[PDB]
Amino acid sequence: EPTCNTPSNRACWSDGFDINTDYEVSTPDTGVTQSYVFNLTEVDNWMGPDGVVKEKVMLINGNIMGPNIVANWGDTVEVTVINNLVTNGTSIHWHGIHQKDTNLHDGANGVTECPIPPKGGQRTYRWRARQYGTSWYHSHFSAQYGNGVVGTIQINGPASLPYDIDLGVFPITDYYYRAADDLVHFTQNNAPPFSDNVLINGTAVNPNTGEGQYANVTLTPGKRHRLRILNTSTENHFQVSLVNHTMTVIAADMVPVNAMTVDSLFLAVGQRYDVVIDASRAPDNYWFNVTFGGQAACGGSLNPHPAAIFHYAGAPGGLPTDEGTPPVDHQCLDTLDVRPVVPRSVPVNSFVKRPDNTLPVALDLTGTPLFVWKVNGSDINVDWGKPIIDYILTGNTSYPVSDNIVQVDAVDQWTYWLIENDPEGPFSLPHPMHLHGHDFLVLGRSPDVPAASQQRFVFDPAVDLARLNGDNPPRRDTTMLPAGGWLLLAFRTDNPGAWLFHCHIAWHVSGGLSVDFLERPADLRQRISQEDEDDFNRVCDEWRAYWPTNPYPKIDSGL
Ligand SMILES: *[C@@H]1O[C@H](CO)[C@@H](O[C@@H]2O[C@H](CO)[C@@H](O)[C@H](O)[C@H]2NC(C)=O)[C@H](O)[C@H]1NC(C)=O
Ligand SMILES: *[C@@H]1O[C@H](CO)[C@@H](O[C@@H]2O[C@H](CO)[C@@H](O)[C@H](O)[C@H]2NC(C)=O)[C@H](O)[C@H]1NC(C)=O
Ligand SMILES: *[C@@H]1O[C@H](CO)[C@@H](O[C@@H]2O[C@H](CO)[C@@H](O)[C@H](O)[C@H]2NC(C)=O)[C@H](O)[C@H]1NC(C)=O
Ligand SMILES: *[C@@H]1O[C@H](CO)[C@@H](O[C@@H]2O[C@H](CO)[C@@H](O)[C@H](O)[C@H]2NC(C)=O)[C@H](O)[C@H]1NC(C)=O
Ligand SMILES: *[C@@H]1O[C@H](CO)[C@@H](O)[C@H](O)[C@H]1NC(C)=O
Ligand SMILES: *[C@@H]1O[C@H](CO)[C@@H](O)[C@H](O)[C@H]1NC(C)=O
Ligand SMILES: [Cl-]
Ligand SMILES: [Cu+2]
Ligand SMILES: [Cu+2]
Ligand SMILES: [Cu+2]
Ligand SMILES: [Cu+2]
Ligand SMILES: [Xe]
Ligand SMILES: [Xe]
Ligand SMILES: [Xe]
């Protein structure tokens, strides 16, 4: 908990801890634990926020999102998850939480654990808050989170700018009336649909019926407000802007950055930005707009103008009256202009593309179903009843090809990775690439061009080394893989474990778009505590015993 964190000095946190402390190697010892229970249930014919009745939802504690997790830098977070769905297993991934030597609590069913069985299955996750900022959690059971199994994480800590009010979490998500599993089946043979609506902080207005409500945020005039924006969608990538206001970014994902004032922001799926907003405009009501760019290549909604209201306290009630100005087209790309407060530096003056450091993404339209995604020649397909961790605990090293294991034995070294976006395929799409267990450095990407321009780019050392940035590049957990192009990433092998790396569009990871970095398997087997081993076995026991009774087939990757 904080001892010197105030509106005038958000840079300070407590004795020996501030915005400049390297939070990757230094953690406050609070001795405090925050507890939550997530009770999952399945509801049919559920009337949602915009009036529309949905066939089926799967909810945490009977709400549209689960608990808002709130703790301090250095606390422990402990969550009991109880699966009262009918047929589905479940696993909760803590997106943005590195799980430093807690790989078994990562929530990747088929990798770190088996799914928690239905009809009362239970498991407790426990992790340390070694990073402060805005994150989120969600099911990793195929596309299950598309049904409602999702919520926010707020870990308090220092910030790179002074601010007066913390408005809290502000999750933005696409919203589909059809259920996740039908959408998985749909996207296996059909391009993904636009979203029926966009929920902002849990609420939206129906574009046809006018039912539902606008998110309504009250700003205190003259004050600096921290707003924690998240994109918790399954596919939609968002552009956001506040009419007649700027936003000053103070963090990207769970990494604080030097303050950057912008008129608008692109958020890929899974991305977060903490911003500061100054209520220094005439007291009034202002639209907060969700827009799309990129020639629909990274999403869209059937609601043409999803919005929230920003209301100055003391202003009249009612709807904003200035519809404002369309933001610049972000071309399905996040900004590489952010600079982490705590710096990292690495050499970018030489690189050789090789099979062992290249991950070629490929759309295969030649099998069944129609749309199958492959990485390095293979579509991922995990075994819920036999996670990689079971191999580790059993000394078995013959992993199925379908597990897309990329084994990395280097101890605490920087590793570089070239991701190629189907430069020779029929067509290519932007993908939000997400890495479990670490933040990566974004050293660079193919030239920024319009998202649907069909331009194809292969890494060329001769011209591309010069475009790389090794001097405190963007560091975060999610970044865009340009359509038709490439992305050059780097992470340090400081955390033994099995760590998924995949596109975060539910339909694409469903259809195979992922690898699994097996980081220091040898060190891993040694760091698994007896309590994690026993509990891993207990849960796998119960799943394996349940699965032969499940009425439904596994129809996708499992992720
Ligand atoms: C998870 O539970 C859902 C909800 O019942 C299942 O989704 C159904 O799946 C079947 C078989 O593919 C479809 O015919 C239905 O249309 C789906 N219903 C809905 C509302 O999506 C899904 O099969 C379950 N997954 C597993 C492996 O148990
Ligand atoms: C997001 O929505 C939540 C849920 O409605 C809001 O939480 C409420 O905040 C108001 C104003 O402080 C309180 O009167 C309620 O008691 C809160 N409800 C709960 C359950 O927390 C939250 O304010 C919204 N976020 C933003 C940024 O406006
Ligand atoms: C959003 O919330 C604010 C805060 O409650 C509402 O502002 C009030 O609006 C009424 C008239 O509707 C005024 O009489 C009050 O003086 C306002 N309170 C404050 C603190 O300014 C506002 O109505 C809400 N906006 C909408 C459209 O629902
Ligand atoms: C921000 O969102 C608002 C509210 O959805 C948009 O306002 C609508 O603008 C359209 C386009 O001309 C009008 O036809 C509607 O009547 C407006 N609706 C309301 C409720 O007033 C606004 O256009 C959006 N601005 C941007 C820049 O996207
Ligand atoms: C889960 O929630 C249900 C429905 O509200 C409740 O009846 C049940 O007791 C809960 N189970 C547990 C173990 O919390
Ligand atoms: C991709 O597969 C090739 C075999 O064709 C292998 O040599 C290479 O190491 C693989 N790359 C990665 C990072 O898995
Ligand atoms: Cl993660
Ligand atoms: Cu995620
Ligand atoms: Cu994740
Ligand atoms: Cu993708
Ligand atoms: Cu994941
Ligand atoms: Xe590099
Ligand atoms: Xe990576
Ligand atoms: Xe990948």
mmCIF file with all atom_site columns, N, CA and C in Angstrom, residues 328-381:
data_model
loop_
_atom_site.group_PDB
_atom_site.id
_atom_site.type_symbol
_atom_site.label_atom_id
_atom_site.label_alt_id
_atom_site.label_comp_id
_atom_site.label_asym_id
_atom_site.label_entity_id
_atom_site.label_seq_id
_atom_site.pdbx_PDB_ins_code
_atom_site.Cartn_x
_atom_site.Cartn_y
_atom_site.Cartn_z
_atom_site.occupancy
_atom_site.B_iso_or_equiv
_atom_site.pdbx_formal_charge
_atom_site.auth_seq_id
_atom_site.auth_comp_id
_atom_site.auth_asym_id
_atom_site.auth_atom_id
_atom_site.pdbx_PDB_model_num
ATOM 1   N N  . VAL A 1 328 ? -8.171  10.742  -37.116 1.00 0.00 ? 328 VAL A N  1
ATOM 2   C CA . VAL A 1 328 ? -7.338  10.234  -38.192 1.00 0.00 ? 328 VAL A CA 1
ATOM 3   C C  . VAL A 1 328 ? -7.478  8.715   -38.281 1.00 0.00 ? 328 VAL A C  1
ATOM 4   N N  . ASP A 1 329 ? -7.377  8.183   -39.494 1.00 0.00 ? 329 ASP A N  1
ATOM 5   C CA . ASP A 1 329 ? -7.454  6.745   -39.721 1.00 0.00 ? 329 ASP A CA 1
ATOM 6   C C  . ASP A 1 329 ? -6.178  6.080   -39.201 1.00 0.00 ? 329 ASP A C  1
ATOM 7   N N  . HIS A 1 330 ? -6.309  5.202   -38.211 1.00 0.00 ? 330 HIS A N  1
ATOM 8   C CA . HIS A 1 330 ? -5.147  4.541   -37.613 1.00 0.00 ? 330 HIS A CA 1
ATOM 9   C C  . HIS A 1 330 ? -4.625  3.299   -38.366 1.00 0.00 ? 330 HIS A C  1
ATOM 10  N N  . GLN A 1 331 ? -5.278  2.935   -39.469 1.00 0.00 ? 331 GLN A N  1
ATOM 11  C CA . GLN A 1 331 ? -4.856  1.819   -40.328 1.00 0.00 ? 331 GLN A CA 1
ATOM 12  C C  . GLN A 1 331 ? -4.586  0.480   -39.610 1.00 0.00 ? 331 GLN A C  1
ATOM 13  N N  . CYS A 1 332 ? -5.379  0.158   -38.596 1.00 0.00 ? 332 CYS A N  1
ATOM 14  C CA . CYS A 1 332 ? -5.185  -1.100  -37.874 1.00 0.00 ? 332 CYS A CA 1
ATOM 15  C C  . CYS A 1 332 ? -3.785  -1.219  -37.247 1.00 0.00 ? 332 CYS A C  1
ATOM 16  N N  . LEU A 1 333 ? -3.222  -0.090  -36.838 1.00 0.00 ? 333 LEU A N  1
ATOM 17  C CA . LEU A 1 333 ? -1.885  -0.095  -36.268 1.00 0.00 ? 333 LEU A CA 1
ATOM 18  C C  . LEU A 1 333 ? -1.790  0.711   -34.977 1.00 0.00 ? 333 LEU A C  1
ATOM 19  N N  . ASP A 1 334 ? -1.196  0.105   -33.950 1.00 0.00 ? 334 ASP A N  1
ATOM 20  C CA . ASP A 1 334 ? -0.880  0.831   -32.720 1.00 0.00 ? 334 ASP A CA 1
ATOM 21  C C  . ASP A 1 334 ? 0.409   1.644   -32.835 1.00 0.00 ? 334 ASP A C  1
ATOM 22  N N  . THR A 1 335 ? 0.500   2.702   -32.039 1.00 0.00 ? 335 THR A N  1
ATOM 23  C CA . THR A 1 335 ? 1.617   3.618   -32.155 1.00 0.00 ? 335 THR A CA 1
ATOM 24  C C  . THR A 1 335 ? 2.889   3.068   -31.517 1.00 0.00 ? 335 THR A C  1
ATOM 25  N N  . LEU A 1 336 ? 3.991   3.214   -32.242 1.00 0.00 ? 336 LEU A N  1
ATOM 26  C CA . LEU A 1 336 ? 5.289   2.779   -31.752 1.00 0.00 ? 336 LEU A CA 1
ATOM 27  C C  . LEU A 1 336 ? 6.069   3.958   -31.187 1.00 0.00 ? 336 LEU A C  1
ATOM 28  N N  . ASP A 1 337 ? 5.357   5.055   -30.937 1.00 0.00 ? 337 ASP A N  1
ATOM 29  C CA . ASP A 1 337 ? 5.972   6.261   -30.398 1.00 0.00 ? 337 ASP A CA 1
ATOM 30  C C  . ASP A 1 337 ? 5.978   6.320   -28.864 1.00 0.00 ? 337 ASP A C  1
ATOM 31  N N  . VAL A 1 338 ? 5.397   5.318   -28.206 1.00 0.00 ? 338 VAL A N  1
ATOM 32  C CA . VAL A 1 338 ? 5.443   5.299   -26.746 1.00 0.00 ? 338 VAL A CA 1
ATOM 33  C C  . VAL A 1 338 ? 6.834   4.899   -26.245 1.00 0.00 ? 338 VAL A C  1
ATOM 34  N N  . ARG A 1 339 ? 7.249   5.511   -25.136 1.00 0.00 ? 339 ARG A N  1
ATOM 35  C CA . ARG A 1 339 ? 8.560   5.253   -24.545 1.00 0.00 ? 339 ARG A CA 1
ATOM 36  C C  . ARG A 1 339 ? 8.426   4.912   -23.064 1.00 0.00 ? 339 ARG A C  1
ATOM 37  N N  . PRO A 1 340 ? 8.703   3.651   -22.716 1.00 0.00 ? 340 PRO A N  1
ATOM 38  C CA . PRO A 1 340 ? 8.597   3.191   -21.318 1.00 0.00 ? 340 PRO A CA 1
ATOM 39  C C  . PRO A 1 340 ? 9.381   4.061   -20.329 1.00 0.00 ? 340 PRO A C  1
ATOM 40  N N  . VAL A 1 341 ? 8.809   4.307   -19.153 1.00 0.00 ? 341 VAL A N  1
ATOM 41  C CA . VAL A 1 341 ? 9.492   5.083   -18.120 1.00 0.00 ? 341 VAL A CA 1
ATOM 42  C C  . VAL A 1 341 ? 10.792  4.395   -17.713 1.00 0.00 ? 341 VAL A C  1
ATOM 43  N N  . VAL A 1 342 ? 10.690  3.109   -17.374 1.00 0.00 ? 342 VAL A N  1
ATOM 44  C CA . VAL A 1 342 ? 11.858  2.282   -17.081 1.00 0.00 ? 342 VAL A CA 1
ATOM 45  C C  . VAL A 1 342 ? 12.368  1.731   -18.410 1.00 0.00 ? 342 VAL A C  1
ATOM 46  N N  . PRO A 1 343 ? 13.596  2.108   -18.804 1.00 0.00 ? 343 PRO A N  1
ATOM 47  C CA . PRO A 1 343 ? 14.078  1.803   -20.151 1.00 0.00 ? 343 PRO A CA 1
ATOM 48  C C  . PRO A 1 343 ? 14.671  0.407   -20.296 1.00 0.00 ? 343 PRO A C  1
ATOM 49  N N  . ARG A 1 344 ? 14.645  -0.098  -21.523 1.00 0.00 ? 344 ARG A N  1
ATOM 50  C CA . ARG A 1 344 ? 15.390  -1.296  -21.878 1.00 0.00 ? 344 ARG A CA 1
ATOM 51  C C  . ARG A 1 344 ? 16.172  -0.928  -23.123 1.00 0.00 ? 344 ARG A C  1
ATOM 52  N N  . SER A 1 345 ? 17.383  -1.456  -23.244 1.00 0.00 ? 345 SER A N  1
ATOM 53  C CA . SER A 1 345 ? 18.168  -1.261  -24.463 1.00 0.00 ? 345 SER A CA 1
ATOM 54  C C  . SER A 1 345 ? 18.702  -2.598  -24.960 1.00 0.00 ? 345 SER A C  1
ATOM 55  N N  . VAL A 1 346 ? 18.642  -2.792  -26.277 1.00 0.00 ? 346 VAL A N  1
ATOM 56  C CA . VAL A 1 346 ? 19.189  -3.974  -26.932 1.00 0.00 ? 346 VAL A CA 1
ATOM 57  C C  . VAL A 1 346 ? 19.734  -3.633  -28.326 1.00 0.00 ? 346 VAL A C  1
ATOM 58  N N  . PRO A 1 347 ? 20.741  -4.398  -28.779 1.00 0.00 ? 347 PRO A N  1
ATOM 59  C CA . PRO A 1 347 ? 21.338  -4.210  -30.102 1.00 0.00 ? 347 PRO A CA 1
ATOM 60  C C  . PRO A 1 347 ? 20.345  -4.503  -31.219 1.00 0.00 ? 347 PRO A C  1
ATOM 61  N N  . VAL A 1 348 ? 20.221  -3.583  -32.167 1.00 0.00 ? 348 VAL A N  1
ATOM 62  C CA . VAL A 1 348 ? 19.449  -3.843  -33.373 1.00 0.00 ? 348 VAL A CA 1
ATOM 63  C C  . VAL A 1 348 ? 20.281  -3.604  -34.635 1.00 0.00 ? 348 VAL A C  1
ATOM 64  N N  . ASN A 1 349 ? 21.607  -3.688  -34.515 1.00 0.00 ? 349 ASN A N  1
ATOM 65  C CA . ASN A 1 349 ? 22.482  -3.348  -35.649 1.00 0.00 ? 349 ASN A CA 1
ATOM 66  C C  . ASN A 1 349 ? 22.876  -4.531  -36.524 1.00 0.00 ? 349 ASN A C  1
ATOM 67  N N  . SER A 1 350 ? 22.352  -5.708  -36.199 1.00 0.00 ? 350 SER A N  1
ATOM 68  C CA . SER A 1 350 ? 22.541  -6.876  -37.038 1.00 0.00 ? 350 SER A CA 1
ATOM 69  C C  . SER A 1 350 ? 21.453  -7.915  -36.785 1.00 0.00 ? 350 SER A C  1
ATOM 70  N N  . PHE A 1 351 ? 21.009  -8.565  -37.849 1.00 0.00 ? 351 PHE A N  1
ATOM 71  C CA . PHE A 1 351 ? 20.002  -9.611  -37.724 1.00 0.00 ? 351 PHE A CA 1
ATOM 72  C C  . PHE A 1 351 ? 20.084  -10.512 -38.929 1.00 0.00 ? 351 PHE A C  1
ATOM 73  N N  . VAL A 1 352 ? 20.004  -11.813 -38.689 1.00 0.00 ? 352 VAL A N  1
ATOM 74  C CA . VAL A 1 352 ? 19.925  -12.794 -39.761 1.00 0.00 ? 352 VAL A CA 1
ATOM 75  C C  . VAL A 1 352 ? 18.642  -13.591 -39.612 1.00 0.00 ? 352 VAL A C  1
ATOM 76  N N  . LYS A 1 353 ? 17.758  -13.481 -40.598 1.00 0.00 ? 353 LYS A N  1
ATOM 77  C CA . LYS A 1 353 ? 16.528  -14.263 -40.596 1.00 0.00 ? 353 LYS A CA 1
ATOM 78  C C  . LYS A 1 353 ? 16.866  -15.743 -40.747 1.00 0.00 ? 353 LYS A C  1
ATOM 79  N N  . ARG A 1 354 ? 16.384  -16.554 -39.808 1.00 0.00 ? 354 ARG A N  1
ATOM 80  C CA . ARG A 1 354 ? 16.593  -18.003 -39.839 1.00 0.00 ? 354 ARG A CA 1
ATOM 81  C C  . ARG A 1 354 ? 15.353  -18.789 -39.421 1.00 0.00 ? 354 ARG A C  1
ATOM 82  N N  . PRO A 1 355 ? 15.261  -20.055 -39.863 1.00 0.00 ? 355 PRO A N  1
ATOM 83  C CA . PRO A 1 355 ? 14.129  -20.898 -39.457 1.00 0.00 ? 355 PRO A CA 1
ATOM 84  C C  . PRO A 1 355 ? 13.882  -20.881 -37.948 1.00 0.00 ? 355 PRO A C  1
ATOM 85  N N  . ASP A 1 356 ? 14.941  -20.887 -37.139 1.00 0.00 ? 356 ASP A N  1
ATOM 86  C CA . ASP A 1 356 ? 14.756  -20.960 -35.689 1.00 0.00 ? 356 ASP A CA 1
ATOM 87  C C  . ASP A 1 356 ? 14.317  -19.657 -35.007 1.00 0.00 ? 356 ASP A C  1
ATOM 88  N N  . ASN A 1 357 ? 14.320  -18.547 -35.747 1.00 0.00 ? 357 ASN A N  1
ATOM 89  C CA . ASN A 1 357 ? 13.861  -17.259 -35.207 1.00 0.00 ? 357 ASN A CA 1
ATOM 90  C C  . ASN A 1 357 ? 12.755  -16.591 -36.029 1.00 0.00 ? 357 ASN A C  1
ATOM 91  N N  . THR A 1 358 ? 12.124  -17.381 -36.890 1.00 0.00 ? 358 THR A N  1
ATOM 92  C CA . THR A 1 358 ? 11.085  -16.866 -37.771 1.00 0.00 ? 358 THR A CA 1
ATOM 93  C C  . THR A 1 358 ? 9.803   -17.658 -37.587 1.00 0.00 ? 358 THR A C  1
ATOM 94  N N  . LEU A 1 359 ? 8.702   -16.941 -37.426 1.00 0.00 ? 359 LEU A N  1
ATOM 95  C CA . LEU A 1 359 ? 7.393   -17.566 -37.310 1.00 0.00 ? 359 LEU A CA 1
ATOM 96  C C  . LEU A 1 359 ? 6.543   -17.078 -38.461 1.00 0.00 ? 359 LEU A C  1
ATOM 97  N N  . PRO A 1 360 ? 6.372   -17.927 -39.484 1.00 0.00 ? 360 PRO A N  1
ATOM 98  C CA . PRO A 1 360 ? 5.607   -17.575 -40.678 1.00 0.00 ? 360 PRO A CA 1
ATOM 99  C C  . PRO A 1 360 ? 4.128   -17.881 -40.495 1.00 0.00 ? 360 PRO A C  1
ATOM 100 N N  . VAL A 1 361 ? 3.300   -16.843 -40.455 1.00 0.00 ? 361 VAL A N  1
ATOM 101 C CA . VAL A 1 361 ? 1.849   -17.007 -40.373 1.00 0.00 ? 361 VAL A CA 1
ATOM 102 C C  . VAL A 1 361 ? 1.267   -17.323 -41.742 1.00 0.00 ? 361 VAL A C  1
ATOM 103 N N  . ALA A 1 362 ? 0.419   -18.350 -41.819 1.00 0.00 ? 362 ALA A N  1
ATOM 104 C CA . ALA A 1 362 ? -0.185  -18.729 -43.103 1.00 0.00 ? 362 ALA A CA 1
ATOM 105 C C  . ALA A 1 362 ? -1.661  -19.145 -43.019 1.00 0.00 ? 362 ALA A C  1
ATOM 106 N N  . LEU A 1 363 ? -2.490  -18.531 -43.863 1.00 0.00 ? 363 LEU A N  1
ATOM 107 C CA . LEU A 1 363 ? -3.882  -18.925 -44.014 1.00 0.00 ? 363 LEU A CA 1
ATOM 108 C C  . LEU A 1 363 ? -3.973  -20.068 -45.015 1.00 0.00 ? 363 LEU A C  1
ATOM 109 N N  . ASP A 1 364 ? -4.434  -21.223 -44.557 1.00 0.00 ? 364 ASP A N  1
ATOM 110 C CA . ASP A 1 364 ? -4.607  -22.377 -45.434 1.00 0.00 ? 364 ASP A CA 1
ATOM 111 C C  . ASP A 1 364 ? -6.078  -22.565 -45.817 1.00 0.00 ? 364 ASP A C  1
ATOM 112 N N  . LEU A 1 365 ? -6.390  -22.359 -47.093 1.00 0.00 ? 365 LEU A N  1
ATOM 113 C CA . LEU A 1 365 ? -7.764  -22.485 -47.576 1.00 0.00 ? 365 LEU A CA 1
ATOM 114 C C  . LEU A 1 365 ? -7.980  -23.780 -48.354 1.00 0.00 ? 365 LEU A C  1
ATOM 115 N N  . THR A 1 366 ? -7.212  -24.815 -48.040 1.00 0.00 ? 366 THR A N  1
ATOM 116 C CA . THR A 1 366 ? -7.201  -26.018 -48.869 1.00 0.00 ? 366 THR A CA 1
ATOM 117 C C  . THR A 1 366 ? -7.646  -27.276 -48.131 1.00 0.00 ? 366 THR A C  1
ATOM 118 N N  . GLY A 1 367 ? -8.080  -27.122 -46.885 1.00 0.00 ? 367 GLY A N  1
ATOM 119 C CA . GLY A 1 367 ? -8.568  -28.248 -46.110 1.00 0.00 ? 367 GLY A CA 1
ATOM 120 C C  . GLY A 1 367 ? -9.999  -28.071 -45.639 1.00 0.00 ? 367 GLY A C  1
ATOM 121 N N  . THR A 1 368 ? -10.282 -28.588 -44.443 1.00 0.00 ? 368 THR A N  1
ATOM 122 C CA . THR A 1 368 ? -11.581 -28.416 -43.800 1.00 0.00 ? 368 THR A CA 1
ATOM 123 C C  . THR A 1 368 ? -11.361 -28.213 -42.297 1.00 0.00 ? 368 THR A C  1
ATOM 124 N N  . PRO A 1 369 ? -11.965 -27.156 -41.742 1.00 0.00 ? 369 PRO A N  1
ATOM 125 C CA . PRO A 1 369 ? -12.863 -26.272 -42.489 1.00 0.00 ? 369 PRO A CA 1
ATOM 126 C C  . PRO A 1 369 ? -12.101 -25.312 -43.398 1.00 0.00 ? 369 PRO A C  1
ATOM 127 N N  . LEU A 1 370 ? -12.825 -24.357 -43.985 1.00 0.00 ? 370 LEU A N  1
ATOM 128 C CA . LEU A 1 370 ? -12.260 -23.428 -44.965 1.00 0.00 ? 370 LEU A CA 1
ATOM 129 C C  . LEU A 1 370 ? -11.113 -22.573 -44.422 1.00 0.00 ? 370 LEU A C  1
ATOM 130 N N  . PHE A 1 371 ? -11.355 -21.890 -43.306 1.00 0.00 ? 371 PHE A N  1
ATOM 131 C CA . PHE A 1 371 ? -10.361 -20.982 -42.736 1.00 0.00 ? 371 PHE A CA 1
ATOM 132 C C  . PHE A 1 371 ? -9.593  -21.633 -41.601 1.00 0.00 ? 371 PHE A C  1
ATOM 133 N N  . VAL A 1 372 ? -8.371  -22.044 -41.928 1.00 0.00 ? 372 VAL A N  1
ATOM 134 C CA . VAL A 1 372 ? -7.443  -22.626 -40.972 1.00 0.00 ? 372 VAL A CA 1
ATOM 135 C C  . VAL A 1 372 ? -6.146  -21.823 -40.969 1.00 0.00 ? 372 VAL A C  1
ATOM 136 N N  . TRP A 1 373 ? -5.720  -21.444 -39.774 1.00 0.00 ? 373 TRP A N  1
ATOM 137 C CA . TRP A 1 373 ? -4.516  -20.639 -39.601 1.00 0.00 ? 373 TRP A CA 1
ATOM 138 C C  . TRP A 1 373 ? -3.367  -21.493 -39.127 1.00 0.00 ? 373 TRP A C  1
ATOM 139 N N  . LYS A 1 374 ? -2.189  -21.250 -39.685 1.00 0.00 ? 374 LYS A N  1
ATOM 140 C CA . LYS A 1 374 ? -1.024  -22.066 -39.370 1.00 0.00 ? 374 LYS A CA 1
ATOM 141 C C  . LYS A 1 374 ? 0.200   -21.207 -39.051 1.00 0.00 ? 374 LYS A C  1
ATOM 142 N N  . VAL A 1 375 ? 1.004   -21.649 -38.087 1.00 0.00 ? 375 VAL A N  1
ATOM 143 C CA . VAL A 1 375 ? 2.263   -20.988 -37.756 1.00 0.00 ? 375 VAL A CA 1
ATOM 144 C C  . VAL A 1 375 ? 3.415   -21.947 -37.985 1.00 0.00 ? 375 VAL A C  1
ATOM 145 N N  . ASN A 1 376 ? 4.333   -21.564 -38.868 1.00 0.00 ? 376 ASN A N  1
ATOM 146 C CA . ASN A 1 376 ? 5.468   -22.409 -39.198 1.00 0.00 ? 376 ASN A CA 1
ATOM 147 C C  . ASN A 1 376 ? 5.043   -23.768 -39.730 1.00 0.00 ? 376 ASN A C  1
ATOM 148 N N  . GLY A 1 377 ? 3.908   -23.808 -40.421 1.00 0.00 ? 377 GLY A N  1
ATOM 149 C CA . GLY A 1 377 ? 3.452   -25.032 -41.053 1.00 0.00 ? 377 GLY A CA 1
ATOM 150 C C  . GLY A 1 377 ? 2.429   -25.843 -40.283 1.00 0.00 ? 377 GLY A C  1
ATOM 151 N N  . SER A 1 378 ? 1.924   -25.297 -39.185 1.00 0.00 ? 378 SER A N  1
ATOM 152 C CA . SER A 1 378 ? 1.056   -26.064 -38.292 1.00 0.00 ? 378 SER A CA 1
ATOM 153 C C  . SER A 1 378 ? 0.001   -25.207 -37.594 1.00 0.00 ? 378 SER A C  1
ATOM 154 N N  . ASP A 1 379 ? -1.237  -25.689 -37.595 1.00 0.00 ? 379 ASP A N  1
ATOM 155 C CA . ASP A 1 379 ? -2.302  -25.074 -36.813 1.00 0.00 ? 379 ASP A CA 1
ATOM 156 C C  . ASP A 1 379 ? -2.325  -25.671 -35.399 1.00 0.00 ? 379 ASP A C  1
ATOM 157 N N  . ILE A 1 380 ? -2.224  -24.819 -34.385 1.00 0.00 ? 380 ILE A N  1
ATOM 158 C CA . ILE A 1 380 ? -2.180  -25.301 -33.004 1.00 0.00 ? 380 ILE A CA 1
ATOM 159 C C  . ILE A 1 380 ? -3.464  -26.047 -32.667 1.00 0.00 ? 380 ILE A C  1
ATOM 160 N N  . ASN A 1 381 ? -3.358  -27.001 -31.753 1.00 0.00 ? 381 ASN A N  1
ATOM 161 C CA . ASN A 1 381 ? -4.498  -27.799 -31.338 1.00 0.00 ? 381 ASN A CA 1
ATOM 162 C C  . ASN A 1 381 ? -4.119  -28.527 -30.066 1.00 0.00 ? 381 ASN A C  1
#
